[PDB]
Structures are given as structure tokens and as C-alpha cells.
Design a binder for these strands. Structure first.
Ligand SMILES: Nc1ncnc2c1ncn2[C@@H]1O[C@H](COP(=O)(O)OP(=O)(O)O)[C@@H](O)[C@H]1O
Ligand SMILES: [Mg+2]
Ligand SMILES: [Zn+2]
Length: 623
RNA sequence: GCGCGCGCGC
RNA sequence: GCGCGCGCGC
């Protein structure tokens, strides 16, 4: 483990070396190579290299609290006995941050803290650090805190404000190629990433690949394009029942066709789900009793279509049978009883169609073949099966557990047993199964295999693209590691210079409750807090919201979130944002996303306050 | 509250 | 830019 002595593997000594030579280096190695151990050695070498009377200072960035706590503990245990001072700062920690940094040798930060401390000038300069280590360093792009930090660095390095600058090291399992759709674009993307981190070296394992390849998941991948049914006669009944039920809806809500942005919805697809969502979440109520009821049936049909597509009709029908038993046993409406009657007409035709052997799903025999072959070769195979939807998980399970040909299988659903069906995972650990099947899923011990099983050309094309994107990546790195370093440094510098040139480049309005459209406040009543937070003055506003005190509060920078504020109109109770304590003031704080803006009385819906270009008046203590 | 990143769809 | 969501930070 990470808390115990380790002999470094040969390839770890191999990856540590550029860093140990003082080079700004991106260390790129697959998950589970031991990136914590490499960074431990690098850090160890960095602080020991200093002559007596001199002292390094290391900062290590973690992007998340759990990772932050893991390394704070690993680094502490590891540098016991050297006598180094070791602490961390995170949101939970909040403190003389300048002095915490000054009086410690190893600091673990989430990076936003350092961004906050640079901007405010509490930490005047990155020059206090002699080494900076970025975990998951591929995040150094695009406004990520890691980039903000590096913009500070680069502004110094390029403004000749000197000031020695810390060595910079990054760790990642994959440098990425971004949007790249060719080698040149891939080379460009990776070069841009090295520019952003001032990296002149990319370290990969070369001399010890066989030693590495002895402990990194790399299954032989397999594309298996298959053919669908010749004719889903089950879909043709369900689709009519679906057309029939949209009709009934369009009765009780005319112009249904307009509520969503999602256009040309097709039955039995992911979109149709999204359309149902972008409609169950609209209206704006005794009519959305009838509507939610109609859309919740169009959902059960949509689901069933998907089960039929990748599993057997029986599996889809059963999910429809089980559903219509629950509705009748719950109680009968004249709308819940109609749909159910509507269904009951076709029931005899569906049950007939379901059991017709020529209606069987050919993709399932293909799944069976795969599972057979392997379990013949390696009978001790433990498998993991990823499927498209939650209903499919149960469908496939049911199908395995009822199939004479797969009796050697013992299935389990997740989030002993010999094959595992699911939609996602953690933990998990795919490398700990010898067989992974992706059964029509948009995704990604030695002798392990991965199979991709689909009748969709699209789905095969996604994996081909992902794979090519990975090849372009490694090819690009191999090319770049051949450059003389001075030539690379010179390419990097001008990417950095260009980047930096770019960085260097009132009437009153109503705010209404999005749900019930009640007048909430006017804009000349709004005040800004710091620059990013919106509060509404006056006592009149206090009556127009209620609040529910959040028993678990969070201490943020500007203030403390103590309560959630909900709409005051009882038939609504809409989420409006929060109520805070800000410098002895009990003030409310609102998200514009909760509200509707009005000028001829024209409604406009904003997501981010940064869009609304109204007159922003800042807070005044006394008013 | 705000900020950051990802994925899908127009 | 718009829609839906998912993860995470202060
Ligand atoms: N030289 C080594 N000696 C013994 N165990 C190691 C060595 N290198 C890595 N490991 C093991 O492999 C695991 C991989 O963890 P970590 O180093 O965090 O992987 P990652 O490369 O994904 O960061 C470590 O927790 C450790 O238990
Ligand atoms: Mg790591
Ligand atoms: Zn309301």
C-alpha cells in the first residue's frame, strides 16, 4: 500500500529521471503504474538535493477532497523520519495561509485555494515554491484552476519578473488529443498542453515496457458487428399504442408539440426519454395531472421498445404486463383505465407475437456464442456485462437465468456470482474480471478480453474513433520525444507568447418565480456581493420567500450558506437559492436561473448572472 | 450562491 | 450560443 515501504520498480526509476534532472516534465503512465510512488521519489530527491543551509518547498495539487486527504496522509507518513513539515489546505480548512505555506516544506492544496490566494495577493508569487506537482495534469486547459495557476506562472516567466520559478511536474494516465481529428491536430493539442505547463519533457516508459506491461490492464479488444431482426412486429403494435396515447395527451394539452426543443422524436430511443423529460418538466396544474399520467405511460412504452430491441419480446411484454398490473391494483381512473384498456386490446396480439419463434432476437444468440466460447476455453471466467438501460439489466439477467445454453452462468445485478450485469460502476475494477462485453453500450489477471457487440454501425464507428484518437496520441508523443529539447523549448515559447497575447485581450426590470410567475422583485433593489453574488434589499422581499434552515451548512469564502430559500406561495414552494451570513448580515442570495426577467412585458430566461447586463449596484453597509 | 470540467442533443 | 444531464471545487 501507499503507507508502507516500497522498492521502486525499474520503470519508476525510469520515469523519475527527467524530473530529477530539473526538467519541467509531464509524466504519463497508465492508471495503476504507481504515480503516487514516482511523485514520492521525485519529491524526495527534490528536497534532498538542496545543499545544507538551503531548503526546498513543494506544493502538490489534488483536484478533489478525497484525493487531497489520501496524499496528505501518504506524504506525511513518507516524510516522517526526514523531518519535513507537511500540511494541507482545503475548503474545509478555509487560517494564515501565507504563514501556513511559509512554515511548511510540503503543502497539499486543492488548487482553487491557491488561485484565491494569488488573486487576492495573499500569496504574492509562485516563487516561494521550488517544486509544483499537478495530479491529473491534463486538466491544465480551458479556465481550469490548474490553468489559472499556470497563467500566473507564465505571466512571470514571460514578463522577466525574476524571481526563480518552481520546477513544474505533471502526472496523468492520458495526455489526451482534445477535439483532434488528425495527427497534426493531435500533435498540436499535446504541444499546447506542454506549453500550458511549461513542460519540455514528456516521460513515458520505454526501457522497461515489458516490466510495465506485466501489470497494466490491456485486454485484446474485439469488434463484433451483427445484424438486427428482419422485422420488429412487436414495435409496430407498441408504436401505434404510443401514437394513440400522444393523441389523448394533445387533447388535454393542445400544442403539446411545442413544449420541447427536441424535434422529430422517434419511439424507443434515448431522445424520446429526453423529450418526455423536456415535457414532464414544463407546463406553467390539474391538467399536468392528466399529462404526467400520459407521459409516464409513453415512458413505459419507450422503455419496452428498448427492451425489445436488445433483449427478447417476452422481456419487453413482461415489463408492460408487470406495469399494467400495478396500475389496476393501485386503483382505476377513467384515464388510467383507458390506457390500460387500450393496452388490453392488443394484449392477446402481443402475447402471441412475443412467443412466435421467428420473432426471437438474433443478437442474443451472438451474445450466447461469445459467452459459450470463452467459458469453454477458460471455464473459470468471471464476466462483466454492460448494458444500455436499467430495464435491460433485468432483461438480460432474466434471459441468462432462463436459458438452457448458459446454465454454467450465475448472474448478479449491481448499483458467489460468475457474471455481472450493469449500466455503470465503482467499485468495480474491470481489470479484475477476465471478460468484458459491451452489449450495445456507448462506452470504452492476464489473458483478459473485451468484446463490443452491436448491430449499430454508429456504435462501431465511435469505438474506431476512440481507438484512433488513442493511437494519434501515442504516435504524437513518440514523435515529440524525438525532438532535440532546445527545438521543443523554442516551439513551446511561442505557443506560450501567442496564448498570452490573447489573455491580455440601466432601466428597471421585474424578476418573477419561474414556476408560478409571481412578482418577486425589481432590479434597482438588487445589490452585488464581492462581484459574483446577488442579494435583494428591503423588507418587502422578506415576505415573498420562505426558507428551510439547512442543518448541514458550508463555510465558503465570502460568507456561510446556512439556509435554503423557497418560494412563499404555498401552491409553489420553488427553489430560489440561499440565505447567508455575510459580515453580521442576514441576507438572501439568489440564482437568476430561478427567475424570469421582464423589460413590452417580454419574458427572458437567463442561466448565468454573467449574461444579464443590468445595472449592477454593489453593497453599501448603511442604507 | 458562484466557479470548473465532462457527456449527450439542436 | 441553446437544451438536458453528470461529476467536482470554493
Ligand atoms: N514499486 C512498487 N512496489 C510495490 N507496490 C507498488 C509499487 N508501485 C505501485 N505499487 C502498488 O500499485 C498501486 C497503484 O496505486 P497508485 O500509485 O496511486 O496508482 P496510479 O498510478 O493509478 O496513481 C499502489 O497503491 C501500490 O499498492
Ligand atoms: Mg495518481
Ligand atoms: Zn412561486
Amino acid at each position: 500500500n501507499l503507507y508502507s515501504p516500497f522498492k521502486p520498480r525499474n520503470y519508476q526509476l525510469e520515469l523519475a529521471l527527467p524530473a530529477m534532472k530539473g526538467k519541467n516534465t509531464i509524466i504519463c503512465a497508465p492508471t495503476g503504474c504507481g504515480k503516487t510512488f514516482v511523485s514520492l521519489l521525485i519529491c524526495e530527491h527534490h528536497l534532498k538535493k538542496f545543499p545544507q543551509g538551503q531548503k526546498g518547498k513543494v506544493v502538490f495539487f489534488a483536484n478533489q477532497i478525497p484525493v487531497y486527504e489520501q496524499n496528505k496522509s501518504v506524504f506525511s507518513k513518507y516524510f516522517e523520519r526526514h523531518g519535513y513539515r507537511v500540511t494541507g489546505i482545503s475548503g474545509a480548512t478555509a487560517v494564515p495561509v501565507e504563514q501556513i505555506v511559509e512554515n511548511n516544506d510540503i503543502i497539499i492544496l486543492t488548487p482553487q485555494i491557491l488561485v484565491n490566494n494569488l488573486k487576492k495577493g495573499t500569496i504574492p508569487s509562485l516563487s516561494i515554491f521550488t517544486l509544483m506537482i499537478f495530479d491529473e495534469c491534463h486538466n491544465t486547459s480551458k479556465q481550469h484552476p490548474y490553468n489559472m495557476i499556470m497563467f500566473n506562472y507564465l505571466d512571470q516567466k514571460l514578463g522577466g519578473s525574476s524571481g526563480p520559478l518552481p520546477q513544474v511536474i505533471g502526472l496523468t494516465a492520458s495526455v489526451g488529443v482534445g477535439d483532434a481529428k488528425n495527427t497534426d491536430e493531435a500533435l498540436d493539442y499535446i504541444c499546447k498542453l506542454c506549453a500550458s505547463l511549461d513542460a519540455s519533457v514528456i516521460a513515458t516508459v520505454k526501457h522497461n515496457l515489458e516490466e510495465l506491461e506485466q501489470v497494466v490492464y490491456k485486454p485484446q479488444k474485439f469488434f463484433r458487428k451483427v445484424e438486427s431482426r428482419i422485422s420488429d412486429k412487436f414495435k409496430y403494435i407498441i408504436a401505434q399504442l404510443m401514437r394513440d396515447t400522444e393523441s389523448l395527451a394533445k387533447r388535454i394539452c393542445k400544442d403539446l408539440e411545442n413544449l420541447s426543443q427536441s424535434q422529430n422524436r422517434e419511439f424507443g430511443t434515448q431522445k424520446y426519454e429526453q423529450w418526455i423529460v423536456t415535457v414532464q418538466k414544463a407546463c406553467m396544474s390539474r391538467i399536468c395531472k392528466a399529462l404526467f399520467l400520459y407521459t409516464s405511460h409513453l415512458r413505459k412504452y419507450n422503455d419496452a421498445l428498448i427492451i425489445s430491441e436488445h433483449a427478447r419480446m417476452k422481456d419487453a411484454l413482461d415489463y408492460l404486463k408487470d406495469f399494467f398490473s400495478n396500475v389496476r391494483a393501485a386503483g382505476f381512473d377513467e384515464i388510467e383505465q383507458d390506457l390500460t384498456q387500450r393496452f388490453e386490446e392488443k394484449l392477446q396480439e402481443l402475447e402471441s407475437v412475443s412467443r412466435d419463434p421467428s420473432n426471437e432476437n438474433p443478437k442474443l444468440e451472438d451474445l450466447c456464442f461469445i459467452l459459450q466460447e470463452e467459458y469453454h476455453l477458460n471455464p473459470e471466467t468471471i464476466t462483466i456485462l454492460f448494458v444500455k438501460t436499467r430495464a435491460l439489466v433485468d432483461a438480460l439477467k432474466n434471459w441468462i437465468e432462463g436459458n438452457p445454453k448458459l446454465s454454467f452462468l450465475k448472474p448478479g445485478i449491481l448499483t458467489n456470482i460468475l457474471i455481472l450485469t450493469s449500466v455503470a460502476d465503482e467499485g468495480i475494477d474491470i481489470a479484475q474480471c477476465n471478460l468484458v462485453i459491451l452489449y450495445e453500450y456507448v462506452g470504452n489477471a492476464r489473458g483478459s478480453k473485451c468484446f463490443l457487440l452491436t448491430s449499430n454501425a454508429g456504435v462501431i464507428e465511435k469505438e474506431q474513433i476512440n481507438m484512433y484518437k488513442e493511437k494519434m496520441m501515442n504516435d504524437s508523443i513518440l514523435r515529440l520525444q524525438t525532438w532535440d529539447e532546445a527545438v521543443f523549448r523554442e516551439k513551446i515559447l511561442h505557443i506560450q507568447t501567442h496564448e498570452k497575447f490573447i489573455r491580455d485581450s440601466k432601466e428597471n426590470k421585474k424578476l418573477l418565480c419561474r414556476k408560478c410567475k409571481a412578482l418577486a422583485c425589481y432590479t434597482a433593489d438588487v445589490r452585488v456581493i464581492e462581484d459574483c453574488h446577488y442579494t435583494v434589499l428591503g423588507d418587502a422581499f422578506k415576505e415573498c420567500f420562505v426558507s428551510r434552515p439547512h442543518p448541514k451548512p458550508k463555510q465558503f469564502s465570502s460568507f456561510e450558506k446556512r439556509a435554503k430559500i423557497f418560494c412563499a406561495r404555498q401552491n409553489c414552494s420553488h427553489d430560489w437559492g440561499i440565505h447567508v451570513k455575510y459580515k453580521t448580515f442576514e441576507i438572501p442570495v439568489i440564482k437568476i436561473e430561478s427567475f424570469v426577467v421582464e423589460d413590452t412585458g417580454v419574458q427572458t430566461l437567463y442561466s448565468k448572472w454573467k449574461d444579464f447586463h443590468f445595472e449592477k449596484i454593489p453593497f453599501d453597509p448603511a442604507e
